[PDB]
């Protein structure tokens, strides 16, 4: 189990750790989160009590270093930092636990929720989407635009998701215009899977990282990317049997975890009615369709 200590908490803030969150009061003696399951990626995120705008946070993996939070009063935010002195870090962690100033990552043992939302998410792939290679952890926030969005301004602070565009030369082979635009299997299986992602696990991981950025930061471009990756598959007549069964699980947990009140801005009506009822794959997402009908019948 791992620990992320905080130096202090100088300002009132709601803290998230994966799908959990806690309110922390200004200068409350709060010094970090313990018991964080090793083995997965994690995200620790922030919403100031004063600015309900700009949710921001950090994706990280405890196997890649000792990470801690410290508020910066020049930049006005909780910053993730890495302690390179292992001994110094055990020393702080042990002292705070002894003083019991830390909340415990509150995992229910039956619950695979987080695993199921990050199964294919790798930290090495994250750090290519959020390029900032002097850091082992990755910063994301509400307002960061994607590379495709930048095309239709600052590249250091962009999300470099894989560009999908149904009306592009990439997606459409000359002479198979109608075929390739109605049946995207070529684009999914040769261009994207064999071409760019190399395997379905990397595809699935980006899909999953995109949803979680949409859900946790309300990142609009990340929601766009998520829905594009779903549509590409659902509009493909030929998809490995193993990918469809894994997608149905992937989406199930994503729909299951979403805040009910956010279903209006996080779920694109068109894409879901297409995938569930019109596409090639309309009969192949049996768990996803059942949970959508029972939780969000209005949207369909």
């Amino acid at each position: 189990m791992n620990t992320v200590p905080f130096t202090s908490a100088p300002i009132e803030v709601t803290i998230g750790i994966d799908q959990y969150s806690f309110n922390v009061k200004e200068n409350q003696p709060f010094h970090g989160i313990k018991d964080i399951p090793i083995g997965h990626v994690h995200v620790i995120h922030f919403q100031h009590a004063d600015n309900s705008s700009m949710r921001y946070g950090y994706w990280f993996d405890c196997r890649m270093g000792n990470f801690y939070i410290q508020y910066d009063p020049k930049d006005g935010l909780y910053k993730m930092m890495e302690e390179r002195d292992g001994a110094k870090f055990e020393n702080i962690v042990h002292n705070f636990k002894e003083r019991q100033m830390m909340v415990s990552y509150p995992k229910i043992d039956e619950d695979d929720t987080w695993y199921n939302l990050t199964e294919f998410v790798q930290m090495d792939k994250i750090r290519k989407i959020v390029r900032k290679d002097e850091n082992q952890f990755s910063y994301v926030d509400s307002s960061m635009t994607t590379v495709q969005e930048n095309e239709l301004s600052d590249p250091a602070h962009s999300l470099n998701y894989t560009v999908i565009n149904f009306k592009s030369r990439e997606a459409i082979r000359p002479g198979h215009e109608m075929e390739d635009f109605l049946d995207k299997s070529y684009y999914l299986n040769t261009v994207m899977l064999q071409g760019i992602f190399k395997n379905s696990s990397n595809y699935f991981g980006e899909l999953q990282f995109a949803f979680l950025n949409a859900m946790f930061f309300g990142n609009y471009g990340s929601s766009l990317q998520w829905h594009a990756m779903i549509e590409l598959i659902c509009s493909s007549a030929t998809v490995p049997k193993h990918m469809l069964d894994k997608l149905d699980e992937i989406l199930y947990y994503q729909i299951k975890t979403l805040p009910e009140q956010y279903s209006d801005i996080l779920l694109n009506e068109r894409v879901w009615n297409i995938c569930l009822y019109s596409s090639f794959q309309k009969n192949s997402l049996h768990n996803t369709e059942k949970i959508m009908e029972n939780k969000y019948p209005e949207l369909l």
């Binding site: 009306k167 592009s168 459409i172 215009e177 635009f181």
Partner: protein, 237 residues
Amino acid sequence: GAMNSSNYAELFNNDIKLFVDDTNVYRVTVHKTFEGNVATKAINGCIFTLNPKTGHLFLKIIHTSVWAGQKRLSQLAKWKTAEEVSALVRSLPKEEQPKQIIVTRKAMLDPLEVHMLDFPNIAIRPTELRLPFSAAMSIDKLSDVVMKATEPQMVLFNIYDDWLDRISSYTAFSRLTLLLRALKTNEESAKMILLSDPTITIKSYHLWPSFTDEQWITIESQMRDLILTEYGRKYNV
């Protein structure tokens, strides 16, 4: 963006553009079979591609053989249209390719866009206008060349005859569409009106009668009267 009554005079500036109308590309007759089911029989059709500034019409004839062995023909027909319009553009000198293509039905946007990917700087636009180009097969000489075709074929016309020698393209297009509107709403009456007088003929190289300026005025007034009468009839107004 969409073409509508507001940006209507853009059609007559010097930026090259084409209308595409696909309504007569896939044409069928419906009939009963011996067992008493219903079957369709396709007939030859056409793509109505038109430069409203100059009157040049590119009449691409769609031979029934194009459909042989295909499914979902009404959908196929939108993709064929896009394929043929693309081939036309590719066939034109650069300085002649259009800067815009206006589709008369929003279903053509996606197929043309896909087929026009090689021409990113040609803008594909829909329209809100209710243009009557589906009546183009009420123009005898056009219906004849489509119905007599024995293979795929492209045939060039000027749909304004020589009108532009005396009127602006604004006025030419308005006469064209008033004419086609009348043919659409009551074909028999419209045609009666154009051809009642045997002494006014159609030149071999023309589509319409060689009316004098004054006679065109009587004609246009008759077509208007026709259209309004048919409207009163349709709605009991």
